[PDB]
Design a protein around this ligand. Structure first.
Ligand SMILES: N=C(N)NC(=O)c1nc(-c2ccoc2)c(N2CCCCCC2)nc1N
Length: 245
């Protein structure tokens, strides 16, 4: 997250921290995700496509820090890694960038909700907020494009939804953006998602309900003028989510 503010897991208790085990046994951070039910985390396919083996991954819930344990956290293995069959990557833009992780502890259990662990509601189909609506994004991704390290403490910020028409403009993204993607940015381009925020939540308040509107997917640079963050439009994937869960 470029700009914004540090936070803790109580302010985004559906946030899932996803790591990969290496040959040799070191564990590194991969991507964010969101808990949509006790046994299911939703994320982005591009996070996993290079290493598509479920046994390589570890999922934490209730975690506020990157490389230290948070009190009350839960650790899970990935019992099921489901990537979207129609995923594609061009140079920047990832199509159908959505993935499901079925989680299960070494004791064979799913998430027990707590003060630090809760689910996030999915939107109703094809129902998103209007352009200019302020939404929030959360993650352990880079604080500056030039940074080598990821922040040790969770961050979040606010961005505003951009219309498909505006994001479709050539000075923005041209036809790289489809109707299954959502664009969002700061009016000053001051704050944004970045590398390492992929897979994490874009949350909007719809009709009084906090709703998983987007999944962090891609962008050209981070917090660059005329280059918004691009998000998988969750309300266009409800059948795929339902069928696979
Ligand atoms: N909202 C944005 N403006 N940007 C992002 O959300 C975002 N940005 C980058 C990025 C762009 C230039 O440096 C890093 C990124 N990457 C990691 C993936 C592996 C190839 C490198 C790109 N993933 C992202 N999800």
């Amino acid at each position: 997250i470029i700009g914004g503010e540090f936070t803790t897991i109580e302010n985004q208790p559906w946030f899932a921290a996803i790591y990969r085990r290496h040959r040799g046994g070191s564990v590194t951070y991969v991507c964010g995700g969101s808990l949509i039910s006790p046994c299911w985390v939703i994320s982005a396919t591009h996070c996993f496509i290079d290493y598509p083996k479920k046994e390589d991954y570890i999922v934490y819930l209730g975690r506020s820090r990157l490389n230290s344990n948070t009190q009350g956290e839960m650790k899970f293995e990935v019992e099921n890694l489901i990537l979207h069959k129609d995923y594609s990557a061009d140079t920047l833009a990832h199509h159908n960038d959505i993935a499901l992780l079925k989680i299960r502890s070494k004791e064979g259990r799913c998430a027990q909700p707590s003060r630090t662990i809760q689910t996030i509601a999915l939107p109703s189909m094809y129902n998103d907020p209007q352009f200019g609506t302020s939404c929030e994004i959360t993650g352990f991704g880079k604080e500056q494009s030039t940074d080598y390290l990821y922040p040790e403490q969770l961050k979040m910020t606010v961005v505003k939804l951009i219309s498909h028409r505006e994001c479709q403009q050539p000075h923005y993204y041209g036809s790289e953006v489809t109707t299954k993607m959502l664009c969002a940015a700061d009016p000053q381009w001051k704050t944004d998602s970045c590398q390492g925020d992929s897979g994490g939540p874009l949350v909007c308040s719809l009709q009084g309900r906090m709703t998983l509107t987007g999944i962090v997917s891609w962008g050209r640079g981070c917090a660059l003028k005329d280059k918004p963050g691009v998000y998988t439009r969750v309300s266009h994937f409800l059948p795929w989510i339902r069928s696979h869960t």
